[PDB]
Design an enzyme around this catalytic site. Structure first.
Site, mmCIF file in Angstrom:
data_model
loop_
_atom_site.group_PDB
_atom_site.id
_atom_site.type_symbol
_atom_site.label_atom_id
_atom_site.label_comp_id
_atom_site.label_asym_id
_atom_site.label_seq_id
_atom_site.Cartn_x
_atom_site.Cartn_y
_atom_site.Cartn_z
ATOM 1 N N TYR A 55 17.848 16.350 -3.361
ATOM 2 C CA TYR A 55 16.884 16.928 -5.047
ATOM 3 C C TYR A 55 16.508 18.590 -3.975
ATOM 4 O O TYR A 55 16.831 19.286 -4.947
ATOM 5 C CB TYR A 55 15.672 16.321 -4.033
ATOM 6 N N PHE A 75 6.219 8.567 0.820
ATOM 7 C CA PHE A 75 7.223 7.333 0.325
ATOM 8 C C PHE A 75 6.355 6.025 0.697
ATOM 9 O O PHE A 75 6.395 4.915 0.531
ATOM 10 C CB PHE A 75 8.258 8.017 0.580
ATOM 11 N N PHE A 141 -1.055 14.826 -7.017
ATOM 12 C CA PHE A 141 0.488 13.575 -6.914
ATOM 13 C C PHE A 141 -0.949 12.881 -6.369
ATOM 14 O O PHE A 141 -0.095 11.633 -6.610
ATOM 15 C CB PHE A 141 1.323 13.961 -6.424
ATOM 16 N N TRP A 289 20.443 9.341 -7.170
ATOM 17 C CA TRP A 289 19.797 8.918 -7.057
ATOM 18 C C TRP A 289 19.542 7.825 -7.584
ATOM 19 O O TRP A 289 19.211 6.243 -7.002
ATOM 20 C CB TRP A 289 18.229 9.508 -6.268
HETATM 21 C C1 LIG Z 1 6.845 8.424 -4.758
HETATM 22 C C2 LIG Z 1 6.485 10.074 -4.645
HETATM 23 C C3 LIG Z 1 6.439 9.903 -3.119
HETATM 24 C C4 LIG Z 1 7.034 10.309 -5.692
HETATM 25 C C5 LIG Z 1 6.945 11.569 -4.974
HETATM 26 C C6 LIG Z 1 8.115 12.651 -6.508
HETATM 27 C C7 LIG Z 1 9.400 12.527 -6.014
HETATM 28 C C8 LIG Z 1 9.859 12.603 -4.516
HETATM 29 C C9 LIG Z 1 10.114 12.184 -7.123
HETATM 30 C C10 LIG Z 1 11.831 11.425 -7.324
HETATM 31 C C11 LIG Z 1 12.178 10.104 -6.940
HETATM 32 C C12 LIG Z 1 11.350 9.533 -7.960
HETATM 33 C C13 LIG Z 1 11.909 9.622 -9.394
HETATM 34 C C14 LIG Z 1 9.785 8.208 -7.551
HETATM 35 C C15 LIG Z 1 9.613 7.618 -8.721
HETATM 36 O O1 LIG Z 1 9.856 6.901 -8.985
HETATM 37 P P1 LIG Z 1 9.825 5.742 -10.502
HETATM 38 O O2 LIG Z 1 8.570 7.069 -11.042
HETATM 39 O O3 LIG Z 1 11.405 5.236 -11.695
HETATM 40 O O4 LIG Z 1 8.901 4.892 -9.969
HETATM 41 P P2 LIG Z 1 7.520 4.677 -9.398
HETATM 42 O O5 LIG Z 1 6.848 6.256 -10.224
HETATM 43 O O6 LIG Z 1 6.599 3.343 -10.489
HETATM 44 O O7 LIG Z 1 6.990 5.164 -8.021
#
Ligand SMILES: CC(C)=CCC/C(C)=C/CC/C(C)=C/COP(=O)(O)OP(=O)(O)O
Ligand SMILES: CC(C)=CCC/C(C)=C/CC/C(C)=C/COP(=O)(O)OP(=O)(O)O
Ligand SMILES: CC(C)=CCC/C(C)=C/CC/C(C)=C/COP(=O)(O)OP(=O)(O)O
Ligand SMILES: [Mg+2]
Lengths: 298, 295, 290, 296
Positions: A55, A75, A141, A289
């Site tokens: 990223y 995470f 966040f 990713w």
């Molecule tokens: C989880 C976390 C610490 C995110 C921080 C920001 C970050 C590193 C984003 C890149 C990875 C990403 C798109 C996660 C969300 O997946 P998704 O939105 O398809 O699944 P979700 O949003 O329901 O967890």
């Protein structure tokens, strides 16, 4: 299968990925209380530092590990939050916020507490000003990690406008700024407001595209561009993914047009040039990713 | 300048096009009251019979002129209505409706009236049962080219669903069935519901793509709507919509096949189904060449 | 016909309104610049709106809120006579002056009024005074200049985040000397959004004439339900009564789930005053020509 | 709990309701093949003829029964359709259309088939012109009983506009005209376009308000859920707001009628028609509050 359309963008991984990955992976392995060994290996297989480097490939060599550590713990917490009620989850993160600010000492006997405290002390040690800048974006966040999603009629325009303000993407862009030592001024940020919104959408829709199979495979609060476009145009989800991917390419071009205009107007400062470049890699990186992460697997 | 993405749909042009042209163009020319030479020349250049032959390439040889006549007058009337008010324009068409059913005045001094009358009698003469089957479809279309609008929020989904019921496209389909002798009873015609809607949508959006520039001379169009929803330029919007049109073409084939897989296909619907495919491709070539969309 | 439906919200009026009004009026009618308007001002009741909005403001703070709004209104009705370029700059020139990074031209009332005003606020409570800076800037910025499909749902969601509404809550906290942590505030986001909607819609209902002389719930509901603007106002007014009920339900839940603090209790009660006050004022002011 | 807001309209039932009901009930009790006598009990309990006289109170004495018999068989087919697939139910009704037009002889050993045939044959007898007039309205409705309604994001506006074209409400209006002997010209109908649309919404929302609990099965598409979600309030609150909106539509109906008159565009036929719609609204409201169709 899908087969992405042509893009003038390409994924780049941080030169030091192997180095940071070993460092960070090692630290959490010795400090974080992973239950069984099976989990211990799920963690390494995850490669959170490898995700971070994908990223933020243009991060400063002596700061990329900070970003890897922050995302790693984030995470990790996100995973735990899954198994606890909105109550305790919210209570869980609120306790870590004052500790993150460094206003409250951590309970040295609880990994997450001292890992968070130490991490933020380290950051304020390397660059106090910038470290204090990412504080709010992070808290925003963390708090959203437990916010209850409201179900309501949503067309494509409304969904996209909503994604333009995604706190996750905001976290990524602010964190990328810390990692790159880009101290942008309020006037510089406002200058790239459209660029950010544009980028935010690209990232979210690409996620929607590869996360759909899993979102539906949830004994299925379905809120995704894939489903919204499929119903509005009355075509299959696959057809929807196809159309959406072309839209993403149009947003990639718009990114170039906006950056080109920014320069012509004579507003493209040295920092902004580095910033918009960074966002380009977030877009291409997030795409790789999404196609590979086990998070979207079934 | 906008490159249409790939398509498996190939357009055809009725073989008799140039022949029906001379026939129908001649009839209207000097019979219909043209204000002047220029008008008559522009009329020929417009080639309404040629337009009709692109849309109905599989029409029956002795029925194609019926369609060419019907659309020619409708294009003409539609041209005169812009200059009239929602008041005048409405009484105009509303008067021709009884005439069209043969129930009233043919007024031999008024071109539009005896032409409409004569045209419909000819149709009833060739195929009574089928000539009637399209009376209401044409009326619906006439009692619409004068209707007003109720302005309310309309997103992409709303605009598309709306176009699926476009009276213009229903008229086309109804006239194609007539021109092809196809008639399959209102059953299975009911079974091609999805197919009709999908098609109507495809025709409407392709028109939007090519008519955006001109329409932008003052907006209810998929181009502006998608552009505002995805926050991209109208040119980017057209590109995306074009891909969507290719998705509807793929969906069309799926609908066709599925009709078969469960034993619903019939000589009638089999021909109908293919005729619609020719409208879609035909409509695309027309939309890219018609002066109607010229600035 | 616009007879407000029954409401359990009873508005309050700061007891010092007469005192502070003549106080804050005399000021502006002394530095700020047809005497026919010099009268329209004293009859505009700018400090009276303030006193209905923050009836529980601290006695030594109420005049601050009044002065701020009295100038934000005076400037507003000043933007109506200048282009986006003019206004945007006009306003933007006042922000640094507001921060105090730029001194004002003693020859320009609008400038030194802003200057002295913010100086007096910092001098009274620097911390809390600094916290109002950004909220005010956001409001002023927006005053200057989306264009897309907006239905009733999109519009109300959009109003849940209105800046002007954000400004009132920030100004209210300052006026009442209410110190609240970002933590406590998080707990009342639903209440905040709900309140923001109520304030905006009541405003839409009464300001429909002025605005129509567009983006407003009245017009949107009118088109979606296919009724008149007046019929629309009536339906929306009842929706406002439902939001009032919801506010009470939320306040009750905050308490039951043991998440209420004394500062938070005062906060949510204050939001109620804003809602009811906003309604009283909107119905009476000639700003929307009664 | 739910107090409907004040209204200038009032429900009204057709005078001959008792006799018509007996007359039409007995008919079906003799011809409709109810398995056991718990369906005949239920059937009688449903009283489809009283429902009809509530919706069409101004109907003519000699026509009101044609309406009751038609809605009775349509209600009955509606229930049977519940125990059949899309493909099945579709073919079922499609079988009955040519029989309705009198083009195909019915199978005398199939009640639904001959009951439909005889009904239209009888109607065409009393008034061939008007009878033929409600052929399409009925067929549009029957074919609608079986198609699928693709689900898509929809705000209040989109939902309301879709309800304005409700084939069921359309059937109601056309049957009311046939029953009141009102033969309106296209011009007259074109003139009452807004009034029909307004009325259609009214009927649908009122139905939504009372069928909501029922629609919450979970063992979808309604103004109640849509408004509650768009304004972020409970379904109960949505109902209260929607009810008021309904009163505005009653006001709009009156304003539209007054205007129609003031423009010299109101004819005797139209005057009787729009009044007939007022009673369809008040009537549908009472029905919505009392029908077992919306219960548990
Ligand atoms: C989880 C976390 C610490 C995110 C921080 C920001 C970050 C590193 C984003 C890149 C990875 C990403 C798109 C996660 C969300 O997946 P998704 O939105 O398809 O699944 P979700 O949003 O329901 O967890
Ligand atoms: C005379 C007439 C139009 C008859 C209708 C039959 C029909 C659909 C013919 C095909 C030609 C066509 C796509 C017209 C649409 O013009 P447009 O909709 O892009 O431009 P406009 O509707 O604003 O006139
Ligand atoms: C046999 C039959 C229904 C004929 C239709 C004629 C008609 C509109 C009668 C009025 C009764 C009414 C409002 C039924 C609505 O059922 P609903 O729409 O609230 O419940 P549903 O449509 O989901 O079955
Ligand atoms: Mg206003």
């Amino acid at each position: 299968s899908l087969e992405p359309p042509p893009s003038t963008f390409q994924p780049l991984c941080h030169p030091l990925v192997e180095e940071v990955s070993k460092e960070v992976d090692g630290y959490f392995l010795q400090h974080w209380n992973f239950p069984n060994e099976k989990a211990r290996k799920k963690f390494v297989a995850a490669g959170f530092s490898r995700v971070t480097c994908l990223y933020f490939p243009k991060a400063l060599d002596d700061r990329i590990h900070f970003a890897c550590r922050l995302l790693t713990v984030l995470f990790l917490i996100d995973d735990l939050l899954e198994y606890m009620s909105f109550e305790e989850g919210s209570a869980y993160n609120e306790k870590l916020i004052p500790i993150s600010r460094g206003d409250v000492l951590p309970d040295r006997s609880i990994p997450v507490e001292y890992i968070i405290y130490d991490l933020w002390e380290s950051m304020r040690a390397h660059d106090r000003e910038m470290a204090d800048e990412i504080l709010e974006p992070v808290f925003l966040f963390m708090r959203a990690q437990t916010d209850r999603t409201r179900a309501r009629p949503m067309g494509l325009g409304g969904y996209l406008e909503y994604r333009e303000r995604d706190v996750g993407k905001e976290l990524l862009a602010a964190l990328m700024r810390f990692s790159m030592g880009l101290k942008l001024s309020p006037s510089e940020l406002q200058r790239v407001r459209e660029i950010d919104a544009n980028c935010s959408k690209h990232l979210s829709v690409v996620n929607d595209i590869y996360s759909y199979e899993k979102e539906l495979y949830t004994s299925k609060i379905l809120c995704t561009s894939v489903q919204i476009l499929a119903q509005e145009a009355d075509v299959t989800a696959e057809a929807a993914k196809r159309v959406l991917f072309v839209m993403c390419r149009e947003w990639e071009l718009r990114h170039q047009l906006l950056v080109a205009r920014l320069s012509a107007e004579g507003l493209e400062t040295p920092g902004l040039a580095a910033y918009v470049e960074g966002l380009e890699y977030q877009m291409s990186g997030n795409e790789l990713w999404s196609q590979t992460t086990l998070r979207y697997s079934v």
